[PDB]
Design a protein around this ligand. Structure first.
Ligand code: OMP
Ligand code: OMP
Ligand code: CL
Ligand code: CL
Lengths: 215, 216
């Protein structure tokens, strides 16, 4: 793990973004843990979060024109990361733009996406549903998606039906031929924060991963 | 009038990025304006960084004590976020734990509960004050306590031409709620700073507009 990933994880517990318990996910799956990025809610935490995203993006060498955040929670993410890229990235990141959608229209707020290289930013990927929806919106605007970044790759399958059992992030990359970046993955949480996870929570996570974990 | 270096720099960028334009614009209040300020055109990382800093300096200057910065959906949302971040970055210990919040158009608050929290409303521009009033009601529904407002531009216009006192939208809001209304710049700043860069024709159009709508 890199230092910024360690700090991200440390702050994730501090602000309670990483919670263990019983959670019904968007996809319907009953999960033993939940990552709530919305809990990085202070000026200090948002600054650190924007920095983590920016570092991951810069180190990827991805070339793009526009960072797009899906409504609603992706909107602040796109804005703060756009800023942070200009602050820590140097000359080629000064003119990167940000955009987002309205839920109902004139759907896109920002410069026209047509023929621009777009990086999608979001919080967490589980089954990949949220990113597919963002893809649809971008394609309607005639944007060219060149990559995606999330804070947490939960490293789960799109569906248990799929025999290959590729993760949601793996399936997006393969389908589109685009990088899918993550600040951290579930494996990083398990290994680094092993002490702060109890024996029961450890087993609950492993049992969950037996059903939903990528191969 | 006084112009801070950061205000001059902000205006320079506003011209550069097309945020500030002169010409015929029908405002959302129906008023036919000789100029328009489109803050959404501060749309790059560099422009947003300067914008966040400008808002932050004005907020710091004011000594306003608050818990939450609230930006109305949709265009208020990035403003709340970037300013919450900037304040923690350049404002010191006092701003480390301030939070941001915003509304959904329909289910409604995104963020920690607003109840019993001191709220700073952030928005782009005030003309007749209609948008800020709508934000007041949202925060009211949520039982938050509004302690201040900040906008990028105070257009210095009346709420209604029928009011004989002729208080501006920002003056009206301030008197009604007993709270400060801050702005990065006002129309007077734009006119004073740009001098002859606004053409004679453009100047007279502004003067004619303010003869109809300008605050006393
Ligand atoms: O429901 C989830 O899958 C989920 C798990 C989690 O740990 N954190 C989390 O925020 N979520 C929510 O579910 C989304 C990810 O699920 P997918 O759209 O299936 O990838 C995120 O965008 C969140 O809205
Ligand atoms: O329509 C306007 O009055 C207006 C003028 C301007 O220069 N810039 C600008 O953005 N506007 C839009 O009008 C709103 C302000 O109008 P009021 O709600 O009357 O105060 C802003 O929130 C913008 O949506
Ligand atoms: Cl959302
Ligand atoms: Cl809007």
């Amino acid at each position: 793990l890199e230092d910024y990933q360690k700090n991200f994880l440390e702050l994730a517990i501090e602000c309670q973004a990483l919670r263990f318990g019983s959670f019904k996910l968007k996809s319907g799956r009953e999960s033993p843990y939940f990552f709530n990025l919305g809990l990085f809610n202070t000026g200090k935490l948002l600054s650190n979060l924007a920095t983590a995203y920016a570092i991951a993006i810069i180190q990827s060498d991805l070339k793009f024109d526009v960072i797009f955040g899906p409504a609603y929670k992706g909107i602040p993410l796109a804005a703060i990361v756009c800023v942070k890229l200009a602050e820590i990235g140097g000359s080629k990141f000064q003119n990167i733009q940000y955009a987002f959608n309205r839920k109902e229209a004139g759907i896109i707020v920002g410069s026209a996406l047509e023929n621009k290289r777009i990086l999608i930013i979001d919080d967490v990927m589980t089954a990949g549903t949220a990113i597919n929806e963002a893809f649809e919106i971008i394609s309607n605007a005639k944007g060219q998606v060149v990559g995606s970044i999330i804070a947490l790759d939960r490293q789960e399958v799109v569906s248990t039906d799929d025999k290959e059992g590729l993760s949601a992030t793996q399936t997006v990359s393969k389908k589109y031929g685009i990088p899918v970046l993550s600040i951290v993955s579930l494996i990083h949480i398990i290994t680094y924060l092993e002490g702060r996870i109890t024996a029961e929570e450890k087993s609950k996570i492993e049992q969950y991963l037996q059903t939903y974990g990528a191969s």
